[PDB]
Each structure stands twice: as structure tokens, then as C-alpha cells.
């Protein structure tokens, strides 16, 4: 028996703006700019964090998503997903170029030849404007299971 205590009623008035966007179906390419042969640990430098960390997007889709030079985008395929730096490129509409790396590895097929000069030919998928952070090279490793 016996019970006694005090109960507060606390809440918070918070401001919040919502966007609600629309993802575009794009072909995610992987061109060998950063040459492999080692691990991201063996090549633990800013080069690996600037080379394969961005996607080149067509002007039309760029405006369609409302991208600003400096934003980051979510890339999604049947293989997986990754957040990379949004950059503009001379690629065709509904298509984006990514340097062959761990970031691309999230959304592309790592079984194919993985060899070719940067012109076209990539893994189909989608891209959208997100508030998320770009997956740091190691954070990406931790995300895939390591």
C-alpha cells in the first residue's frame, strides 16, 4: 500500500518545414578514374574522399530535383543505396556518372568487367535530393556490414 508522487506536463513548440520531393530514374555509371589494386585503408587519403565521392547529373534533372551546387543526393538501385556529393555533368538526361569506387559499389554490380573509359554504359537506378550526410569512406564500410 501507499503511493505518492508528482507528474509534470511538458511539451515543446517547434518550427518545421517539409519539402516532399520526387526521385528521378537515372543510369548510374562507374568509370575507372581512381585506379584500384589496393584497399581504401591502403589508400587512406583525401584523394579517395574526393575522387569517387560525387555523381555527375544532367542539367535538366538537376533543376527537376532542385539541386544546388554543393548539395548531396541519395542514389538507389536494385543492388543498394548511397549518399554522394551532387555535381553537374554533360551526361544525357535520366543518367548520372560516378567514378568507380566503394560509393558506386553500393548501387552498381561489382561482378562485371569493371573496365571502360568514361563515356556511357552504367547500372540503372534512381536519384533524389536528401538532407542526409554523404557516407564517409569508412562509414560506408561500417554500413555494408564491416
PDB file of N, CA, C and O in Angstrom, residues 57-123:
ATOM      1  N   UNK A  57      25.424  14.879 -62.721  1.00  0.00           N
ATOM      2  CA  UNK A  57      23.998  14.855 -63.054  1.00  0.00           C
ATOM      3  C   UNK A  57      23.673  15.815 -64.211  1.00  0.00           C
ATOM      4  O   UNK A  57      24.244  16.903 -64.301  1.00  0.00           O
ATOM      5  N   UNK A  58      22.756  15.410 -65.091  1.00  0.00           N
ATOM      6  CA  UNK A  58      22.348  16.251 -66.224  1.00  0.00           C
ATOM      7  C   UNK A  58      21.642  17.533 -65.748  1.00  0.00           C
ATOM      8  O   UNK A  58      20.969  17.541 -64.717  1.00  0.00           O
ATOM      9  N   UNK A  59      21.795  18.607 -66.521  1.00  0.00           N
ATOM     10  CA  UNK A  59      21.196  19.907 -66.192  1.00  0.00           C
ATOM     11  C   UNK A  59      19.676  19.804 -65.949  1.00  0.00           C
ATOM     12  O   UNK A  59      19.165  20.281 -64.935  1.00  0.00           O
ATOM     13  N   UNK A  60      18.962  19.165 -66.873  1.00  0.00           N
ATOM     14  CA  UNK A  60      17.502  19.048 -66.778  1.00  0.00           C
ATOM     15  C   UNK A  60      17.067  18.388 -65.457  1.00  0.00           C
ATOM     16  O   UNK A  60      16.235  18.931 -64.726  1.00  0.00           O
ATOM     17  N   UNK A  61      17.648  17.229 -65.147  1.00  0.00           N
ATOM     18  CA  UNK A  61      17.329  16.509 -63.907  1.00  0.00           C
ATOM     19  C   UNK A  61      17.791  17.305 -62.678  1.00  0.00           C
ATOM     20  O   UNK A  61      17.133  17.305 -61.635  1.00  0.00           O
ATOM     21  N   UNK A  62      18.927  17.989 -62.821  1.00  0.00           N
ATOM     22  CA  UNK A  62      19.472  18.852 -61.768  1.00  0.00           C
ATOM     23  C   UNK A  62      18.420  19.870 -61.290  1.00  0.00           C
ATOM     24  O   UNK A  62      18.169  20.008 -60.088  1.00  0.00           O
ATOM     25  N   UNK A  63      17.796  20.569 -62.240  1.00  0.00           N
ATOM     26  CA  UNK A  63      16.734  21.533 -61.918  1.00  0.00           C
ATOM     27  C   UNK A  63      15.451  20.817 -61.464  1.00  0.00           C
ATOM     28  O   UNK A  63      14.753  21.285 -60.562  1.00  0.00           O
ATOM     29  N   UNK A  64      15.154  19.673 -62.086  1.00  0.00           N
ATOM     30  CA  UNK A  64      13.968  18.874 -61.739  1.00  0.00           C
ATOM     31  C   UNK A  64      13.981  18.421 -60.269  1.00  0.00           C
ATOM     32  O   UNK A  64      12.929  18.284 -59.638  1.00  0.00           O
ATOM     33  N   UNK A  65      15.174  18.172 -59.737  1.00  0.00           N
ATOM     34  CA  UNK A  65      15.337  17.780 -58.334  1.00  0.00           C
ATOM     35  C   UNK A  65      15.529  18.998 -57.419  1.00  0.00           C
ATOM     36  O   UNK A  65      15.424  18.883 -56.195  1.00  0.00           O
ATOM     37  N   UNK A  66      15.798  20.159 -58.015  1.00  0.00           N
ATOM     38  CA  UNK A  66      16.097  21.355 -57.233  1.00  0.00           C
ATOM     39  C   UNK A  66      17.428  21.245 -56.504  1.00  0.00           C
ATOM     40  O   UNK A  66      17.506  21.412 -55.283  1.00  0.00           O
ATOM     41  N   UNK A  67      18.475  20.930 -57.255  1.00  0.00           N
ATOM     42  CA  UNK A  67      19.812  20.770 -56.689  1.00  0.00           C
ATOM     43  C   UNK A  67      20.614  22.079 -56.739  1.00  0.00           C
ATOM     44  O   UNK A  67      20.597  22.809 -57.736  1.00  0.00           O
ATOM     45  N   UNK A  68      21.315  22.372 -55.655  1.00  0.00           N
ATOM     46  CA  UNK A  68      22.248  23.495 -55.615  1.00  0.00           C
ATOM     47  C   UNK A  68      23.688  22.971 -55.611  1.00  0.00           C
ATOM     48  O   UNK A  68      23.978  21.935 -55.006  1.00  0.00           O
ATOM     49  N   UNK A  69      24.579  23.671 -56.301  1.00  0.00           N
ATOM     50  CA  UNK A  69      25.980  23.257 -56.391  1.00  0.00           C
ATOM     51  C   UNK A  69      26.639  23.242 -55.006  1.00  0.00           C
ATOM     52  O   UNK A  69      27.028  24.281 -54.461  1.00  0.00           O
ATOM     53  N   UNK A  70      26.737  22.041 -54.440  1.00  0.00           N
ATOM     54  CA  UNK A  70      27.201  21.868 -53.065  1.00  0.00           C
ATOM     55  C   UNK A  70      26.333  20.895 -52.258  1.00  0.00           C
ATOM     56  O   UNK A  70      26.733  20.444 -51.183  1.00  0.00           O
ATOM     57  N   UNK A  71      25.138  20.576 -52.769  1.00  0.00           N
ATOM     58  CA  UNK A  71      24.231  19.621 -52.108  1.00  0.00           C
ATOM     59  C   UNK A  71      24.726  18.166 -52.214  1.00  0.00           C
ATOM     60  O   UNK A  71      25.755  17.875 -52.830  1.00  0.00           O
ATOM     61  N   UNK A  72      23.962  17.257 -51.609  1.00  0.00           N
ATOM     62  CA  UNK A  72      24.233  15.818 -51.688  1.00  0.00           C
ATOM     63  C   UNK A  72      22.949  15.054 -52.047  1.00  0.00           C
ATOM     64  O   UNK A  72      21.847  15.468 -51.680  1.00  0.00           O
ATOM     65  N   UNK A  73      23.091  13.947 -52.770  1.00  0.00           N
ATOM     66  CA  UNK A  73      21.932  13.203 -53.273  1.00  0.00           C
ATOM     67  C   UNK A  73      21.936  11.728 -52.843  1.00  0.00           C
ATOM     68  O   UNK A  73      22.988  11.131 -52.596  1.00  0.00           O
ATOM     69  N   UNK A  74      20.737  11.158 -52.755  1.00  0.00           N
ATOM     70  CA  UNK A  74      20.558   9.734 -52.466  1.00  0.00           C
ATOM     71  C   UNK A  74      20.419   8.934 -53.771  1.00  0.00           C
ATOM     72  O   UNK A  74      19.528   9.200 -54.580  1.00  0.00           O
ATOM     73  N   UNK A  75      21.301   7.963 -53.968  1.00  0.00           N
ATOM     74  CA  UNK A  75      21.276   7.107 -55.158  1.00  0.00           C
ATOM     75  C   UNK A  75      20.809   5.697 -54.784  1.00  0.00           C
ATOM     76  O   UNK A  75      21.366   5.073 -53.880  1.00  0.00           O
ATOM     77  N   UNK A  76      19.781   5.202 -55.473  1.00  0.00           N
ATOM     78  CA  UNK A  76      19.158   3.919 -55.124  1.00  0.00           C
ATOM     79  C   UNK A  76      18.934   3.022 -56.347  1.00  0.00           C
ATOM     80  O   UNK A  76      18.407   3.454 -57.372  1.00  0.00           O
ATOM     81  N   UNK A  77      19.337   1.764 -56.214  1.00  0.00           N
ATOM     82  CA  UNK A  77      19.163   0.754 -57.271  1.00  0.00           C
ATOM     83  C   UNK A  77      18.626  -0.555 -56.683  1.00  0.00           C
ATOM     84  O   UNK A  77      18.243  -0.610 -55.509  1.00  0.00           O
ATOM     85  N   UNK A  78      18.591  -1.611 -57.493  1.00  0.00           N
ATOM     86  CA  UNK A  78      18.176  -2.931 -57.002  1.00  0.00           C
ATOM     87  C   UNK A  78      19.286  -3.565 -56.149  1.00  0.00           C
ATOM     88  O   UNK A  78      19.038  -4.485 -55.365  1.00  0.00           O
ATOM     89  N   UNK A  79      20.510  -3.059 -56.301  1.00  0.00           N
ATOM     90  CA  UNK A  79      21.659  -3.548 -55.530  1.00  0.00           C
ATOM     91  C   UNK A  79      21.696  -2.931 -54.123  1.00  0.00           C
ATOM     92  O   UNK A  79      21.766  -3.650 -53.124  1.00  0.00           O
ATOM     93  N   UNK A  80      21.634  -1.604 -54.049  1.00  0.00           N
ATOM     94  CA  UNK A  80      21.668  -0.925 -52.755  1.00  0.00           C
ATOM     95  C   UNK A  80      21.433   0.581 -52.856  1.00  0.00           C
ATOM     96  O   UNK A  80      20.743   1.052 -53.761  1.00  0.00           O
ATOM     97  N   UNK A  81      22.014   1.336 -51.924  1.00  0.00           N
ATOM     98  CA  UNK A  81      21.846   2.795 -51.881  1.00  0.00           C
ATOM     99  C   UNK A  81      23.099   3.488 -51.319  1.00  0.00           C
ATOM    100  O   UNK A  81      23.860   2.891 -50.556  1.00  0.00           O
ATOM    101  N   UNK A  82      23.306   4.750 -51.696  1.00  0.00           N
ATOM    102  CA  UNK A  82      24.448   5.531 -51.198  1.00  0.00           C
ATOM    103  C   UNK A  82      24.189   7.049 -51.314  1.00  0.00           C
ATOM    104  O   UNK A  82      23.513   7.502 -52.237  1.00  0.00           O
ATOM    105  N   UNK A  83      24.708   7.825 -50.358  1.00  0.00           N
ATOM    106  CA  UNK A  83      24.621   9.294 -50.415  1.00  0.00           C
ATOM    107  C   UNK A  83      25.959   9.898 -50.868  1.00  0.00           C
ATOM    108  O   UNK A  83      26.970   9.759 -50.179  1.00  0.00           O
ATOM    109  N   UNK A  84      25.961  10.566 -52.023  1.00  0.00           N
ATOM    110  CA  UNK A  84      27.187  11.172 -52.570  1.00  0.00           C
ATOM    111  C   UNK A  84      27.000  12.669 -52.872  1.00  0.00           C
ATOM    112  O   UNK A  84      25.876  13.175 -52.893  1.00  0.00           O
ATOM    113  N   UNK A  85      28.108  13.374 -53.108  1.00  0.00           N
ATOM    114  CA  UNK A  85      28.065  14.803 -53.440  1.00  0.00           C
ATOM    115  C   UNK A  85      27.455  15.039 -54.832  1.00  0.00           C
ATOM    116  O   UNK A  85      27.849  14.408 -55.815  1.00  0.00           O
ATOM    117  N   UNK A  86      26.498  15.957 -54.909  1.00  0.00           N
ATOM    118  CA  UNK A  86      25.833  16.274 -56.175  1.00  0.00           C
ATOM    119  C   UNK A  86      26.657  17.252 -57.023  1.00  0.00           C
ATOM    120  O   UNK A  86      26.954  18.367 -56.591  1.00  0.00           O
ATOM    121  N   UNK A  87      27.033  16.823 -58.223  1.00  0.00           N
ATOM    122  CA  UNK A  87      27.729  17.687 -59.182  1.00  0.00           C
ATOM    123  C   UNK A  87      27.091  17.580 -60.561  1.00  0.00           C
ATOM    124  O   UNK A  87      26.417  16.600 -60.873  1.00  0.00           O
ATOM    125  N   UNK A  88      27.289  18.601 -61.376  1.00  0.00           N
ATOM    126  CA  UNK A  88      26.659  18.664 -62.683  1.00  0.00           C
ATOM    127  C   UNK A  88      27.590  18.119 -63.777  1.00  0.00           C
ATOM    128  O   UNK A  88      28.797  18.358 -63.753  1.00  0.00           O
ATOM    129  N   UNK A  89      27.022  17.387 -64.733  1.00  0.00           N
ATOM    130  CA  UNK A  89      27.826  16.776 -65.787  1.00  0.00           C
ATOM    131  C   UNK A  89      27.170  16.829 -67.161  1.00  0.00           C
ATOM    132  O   UNK A  89      25.979  17.114 -67.284  1.00  0.00           O
ATOM    133  N   UNK A  90      27.951  16.527 -68.196  1.00  0.00           N
ATOM    134  CA  UNK A  90      27.473  16.564 -69.585  1.00  0.00           C
ATOM    135  C   UNK A  90      26.841  15.221 -70.014  1.00  0.00           C
ATOM    136  O   UNK A  90      26.722  14.922 -71.207  1.00  0.00           O
ATOM    137  N   UNK A  91      26.426  14.428 -69.029  1.00  0.00           N
ATOM    138  CA  UNK A  91      25.756  13.145 -69.281  1.00  0.00           C
ATOM    139  C   UNK A  91      24.310  13.359 -69.775  1.00  0.00           C
ATOM    140  O   UNK A  91      23.701  14.382 -69.477  1.00  0.00           O
ATOM    141  N   UNK A  92      23.741  12.404 -70.544  1.00  0.00           N
ATOM    142  CA  UNK A  92      22.352  12.515 -71.045  1.00  0.00           C
ATOM    143  C   UNK A  92      21.307  12.521 -69.912  1.00  0.00           C
ATOM    144  O   UNK A  92      21.586  12.082 -68.795  1.00  0.00           O
ATOM    145  N   UNK A  93      20.098  13.014 -70.205  1.00  0.00           N
ATOM    146  CA  UNK A  93      19.044  13.101 -69.187  1.00  0.00           C
ATOM    147  C   UNK A  93      18.627  11.704 -68.687  1.00  0.00           C
ATOM    148  O   UNK A  93      18.639  10.725 -69.445  1.00  0.00           O
ATOM    149  N   UNK A  94      18.246  11.617 -67.411  1.00  0.00           N
ATOM    150  CA  UNK A  94      17.935  10.328 -66.805  1.00  0.00           C
ATOM    151  C   UNK A  94      19.158   9.419 -66.707  1.00  0.00           C
ATOM    152  O   UNK A  94      19.052   8.197 -66.841  1.00  0.00           O
ATOM    153  N   UNK A  95      20.325  10.017 -66.472  1.00  0.00           N
ATOM    154  CA  UNK A  95      21.581   9.277 -66.407  1.00  0.00           C
ATOM    155  C   UNK A  95      22.632  10.069 -65.608  1.00  0.00           C
ATOM    156  O   UNK A  95      22.749  11.281 -65.764  1.00  0.00           O
ATOM    157  N   UNK A  96      23.383   9.387 -64.739  1.00  0.00           N
ATOM    158  CA  UNK A  96      24.407  10.052 -63.913  1.00  0.00           C
ATOM    159  C   UNK A  96      25.725   9.262 -63.897  1.00  0.00           C
ATOM    160  O   UNK A  96      25.728   8.032 -63.901  1.00  0.00           O
ATOM    161  N   UNK A  97      26.844   9.978 -63.875  1.00  0.00           N
ATOM    162  CA  UNK A  97      28.169   9.345 -63.866  1.00  0.00           C
ATOM    163  C   UNK A  97      28.799   9.363 -62.466  1.00  0.00           C
ATOM    164  O   UNK A  97      28.889  10.411 -61.831  1.00  0.00           O
ATOM    165  N   UNK A  98      29.244   8.200 -61.996  1.00  0.00           N
ATOM    166  CA  UNK A  98      30.005   8.111 -60.746  1.00  0.00           C
ATOM    167  C   UNK A  98      31.354   7.405 -60.983  1.00  0.00           C
ATOM    168  O   UNK A  98      31.420   6.388 -61.674  1.00  0.00           O
ATOM    169  N   UNK A  99      32.460   7.961 -60.458  1.00  0.00           N
ATOM    170  CA  UNK A  99      33.773   7.294 -60.506  1.00  0.00           C
ATOM    171  C   UNK A  99      33.759   5.925 -59.793  1.00  0.00           C
ATOM    172  O   UNK A  99      33.293   5.810 -58.656  1.00  0.00           O
ATOM    173  N   UNK A 100      34.262   4.893 -60.474  1.00  0.00           N
ATOM    174  CA  UNK A 100      34.247   3.518 -59.957  1.00  0.00           C
ATOM    175  C   UNK A 100      34.904   3.433 -58.564  1.00  0.00           C
ATOM    176  O   UNK A 100      36.128   3.514 -58.435  1.00  0.00           O
ATOM    177  N   UNK A 101      34.083   3.271 -57.527  1.00  0.00           N
ATOM    178  CA  UNK A 101      34.602   3.188 -56.163  1.00  0.00           C
ATOM    179  C   UNK A 101      33.607   2.571 -55.184  1.00  0.00           C
ATOM    180  O   UNK A 101      32.552   2.096 -55.599  1.00  0.00           O
ATOM    181  N   UNK A 102      33.906   2.578 -53.868  1.00  0.00           N
ATOM    182  CA  UNK A 102      33.021   1.994 -52.835  1.00  0.00           C
ATOM    183  C   UNK A 102      31.605   2.600 -52.854  1.00  0.00           C
ATOM    184  O   UNK A 102      30.614   1.899 -52.647  1.00  0.00           O
ATOM    185  N   UNK A 103      31.526   3.903 -53.114  1.00  0.00           N
ATOM    186  CA  UNK A 103      30.244   4.605 -53.229  1.00  0.00           C
ATOM    187  C   UNK A 103      29.402   4.014 -54.368  1.00  0.00           C
ATOM    188  O   UNK A 103      28.250   3.627 -54.169  1.00  0.00           O
ATOM    189  N   UNK A 104      29.994   3.931 -55.559  1.00  0.00           N
ATOM    190  CA  UNK A 104      29.338   3.297 -56.706  1.00  0.00           C
ATOM    191  C   UNK A 104      29.033   1.816 -56.417  1.00  0.00           C
ATOM    192  O   UNK A 104      27.965   1.315 -56.753  1.00  0.00           O
ATOM    193  N   UNK A 105      29.977   1.137 -55.763  1.00  0.00           N
ATOM    194  CA  UNK A 105      29.834  -0.280 -55.386  1.00  0.00           C
ATOM    195  C   UNK A 105      28.523  -0.548 -54.623  1.00  0.00           C
ATOM    196  O   UNK A 105      27.994  -1.660 -54.651  1.00  0.00           O
ATOM    197  N   UNK A 106      28.008   0.476 -53.948  1.00  0.00           N
ATOM    198  CA  UNK A 106      26.753   0.361 -53.193  1.00  0.00           C
ATOM    199  C   UNK A 106      25.546   0.149 -54.117  1.00  0.00           C
ATOM    200  O   UNK A 106      24.581  -0.522 -53.749  1.00  0.00           O
ATOM    201  N   UNK A 107      25.614   0.719 -55.321  1.00  0.00           N
ATOM    202  CA  UNK A 107      24.465   0.748 -56.235  1.00  0.00           C
ATOM    203  C   UNK A 107      24.741   0.031 -57.568  1.00  0.00           C
ATOM    204  O   UNK A 107      23.815  -0.251 -58.328  1.00  0.00           O
ATOM    205  N   UNK A 108      26.003  -0.267 -57.857  1.00  0.00           N
ATOM    206  CA  UNK A 108      26.359  -0.938 -59.114  1.00  0.00           C
ATOM    207  C   UNK A 108      26.606  -2.443 -58.907  1.00  0.00           C
ATOM    208  O   UNK A 108      26.494  -2.960 -57.794  1.00  0.00           O
ATOM    209  N   UNK A 109      26.944  -3.137 -59.992  1.00  0.00           N
ATOM    210  CA  UNK A 109      27.334  -4.548 -59.926  1.00  0.00           C
ATOM    211  C   UNK A 109      28.869  -4.687 -59.918  1.00  0.00           C
ATOM    212  O   UNK A 109      29.537  -4.321 -60.885  1.00  0.00           O
ATOM    213  N   UNK A 110      29.454  -5.206 -58.821  1.00  0.00           N
ATOM    214  CA  UNK A 110      30.906  -5.411 -58.710  1.00  0.00           C
ATOM    215  C   UNK A 110      31.396  -6.715 -59.376  1.00  0.00           C
ATOM    216  O   UNK A 110      32.572  -7.062 -59.278  1.00  0.00           O
ATOM    217  N   UNK A 111      30.495  -7.436 -60.045  1.00  0.00           N
ATOM    218  CA  UNK A 111      30.847  -8.714 -60.689  1.00  0.00           C
ATOM    219  C   UNK A 111      31.273  -8.523 -62.154  1.00  0.00           C
ATOM    220  O   UNK A 111      32.068  -9.301 -62.688  1.00  0.00           O
ATOM    221  N   UNK A 112      30.725  -7.496 -62.800  1.00  0.00           N
ATOM    222  CA  UNK A 112      31.015  -7.199 -64.214  1.00  0.00           C
ATOM    223  C   UNK A 112      32.508  -6.904 -64.468  1.00  0.00           C
ATOM    224  O   UNK A 112      33.337  -6.983 -63.561  1.00  0.00           O
ATOM    225  N   UNK A 113      32.844  -6.572 -65.713  1.00  0.00           N
ATOM    226  CA  UNK A 113      34.233  -6.319 -66.117  1.00  0.00           C
ATOM    227  C   UNK A 113      34.862  -5.141 -65.352  1.00  0.00           C
ATOM    228  O   UNK A 113      36.084  -5.079 -65.188  1.00  0.00           O
ATOM    229  N   UNK A 114      34.028  -4.199 -64.908  1.00  0.00           N
ATOM    230  CA  UNK A 114      34.519  -3.025 -64.183  1.00  0.00           C
ATOM    231  C   UNK A 114      35.619  -2.268 -64.931  1.00  0.00           C
ATOM    232  O   UNK A 114      36.469  -1.616 -64.318  1.00  0.00           O
ATOM    233  N   UNK A 115      35.597  -2.354 -66.261  1.00  0.00           N
ATOM    234  CA  UNK A 115      36.621  -1.730 -67.108  1.00  0.00           C
ATOM    235  C   UNK A 115      35.982  -0.965 -68.269  1.00  0.00           C
ATOM    236  O   UNK A 115      35.134  -1.502 -68.980  1.00  0.00           O
ATOM    237  N   UNK A 116      36.393   0.285 -68.453  1.00  0.00           N
ATOM    238  CA  UNK A 116      35.850   1.111 -69.525  1.00  0.00           C
ATOM    239  C   UNK A 116      36.145   2.594 -69.334  1.00  0.00           C
ATOM    240  O   UNK A 116      36.256   3.076 -68.203  1.00  0.00           O
ATOM    241  N   UNK A 117      36.283   3.315 -70.444  1.00  0.00           N
ATOM    242  CA  UNK A 117      36.533   4.759 -70.403  1.00  0.00           C
ATOM    243  C   UNK A 117      35.225   5.545 -70.196  1.00  0.00           C
ATOM    244  O   UNK A 117      34.163   5.141 -70.675  1.00  0.00           O
ATOM    245  N   UNK A 118      35.286   6.694 -69.494  1.00  0.00           N
ATOM    246  CA  UNK A 118      34.084   7.457 -69.123  1.00  0.00           C
ATOM    247  C   UNK A 118      33.362   8.089 -70.327  1.00  0.00           C
ATOM    248  O   UNK A 118      33.684   9.200 -70.755  1.00  0.00           O
ATOM    249  N   UNK A 119      32.404   7.352 -70.890  1.00  0.00           N
ATOM    250  CA  UNK A 119      31.541   7.871 -71.964  1.00  0.00           C
ATOM    251  C   UNK A 119      30.063   7.587 -71.651  1.00  0.00           C
ATOM    252  O   UNK A 119      29.238   8.499 -71.598  1.00  0.00           O
ATOM    253  N   UNK A 120      29.750   6.309 -71.447  1.00  0.00           N
ATOM    254  CA  UNK A 120      28.384   5.858 -71.146  1.00  0.00           C
ATOM    255  C   UNK A 120      28.427   4.463 -70.496  1.00  0.00           C
ATOM    256  O   UNK A 120      29.464   4.069 -69.960  1.00  0.00           O
ATOM    257  N   UNK A 121      27.305   3.729 -70.537  1.00  0.00           N
ATOM    258  CA  UNK A 121      27.250   2.336 -70.049  1.00  0.00           C
ATOM    259  C   UNK A 121      27.348   2.272 -68.515  1.00  0.00           C
ATOM    260  O   UNK A 121      28.437   2.327 -67.943  1.00  0.00           O
ATOM    261  N   UNK A 122      26.205   2.153 -67.851  1.00  0.00           N
ATOM    262  CA  UNK A 122      26.193   2.077 -66.399  1.00  0.00           C
ATOM    263  C   UNK A 122      25.019   1.273 -65.843  1.00  0.00           C
ATOM    264  O   UNK A 122      24.191   0.755 -66.595  1.00  0.00           O
ATOM    265  N   UNK A 123      24.951   1.165 -64.520  1.00  0.00           N
ATOM    266  CA  UNK A 123      23.856   0.433 -63.852  1.00  0.00           C
ATOM    267  C   UNK A 123      22.621   1.325 -63.623  1.00  0.00           C
ATOM    268  O   UNK A 123      22.707   2.367 -62.981  1.00  0.00           O
TER     269      UNK A 123
END
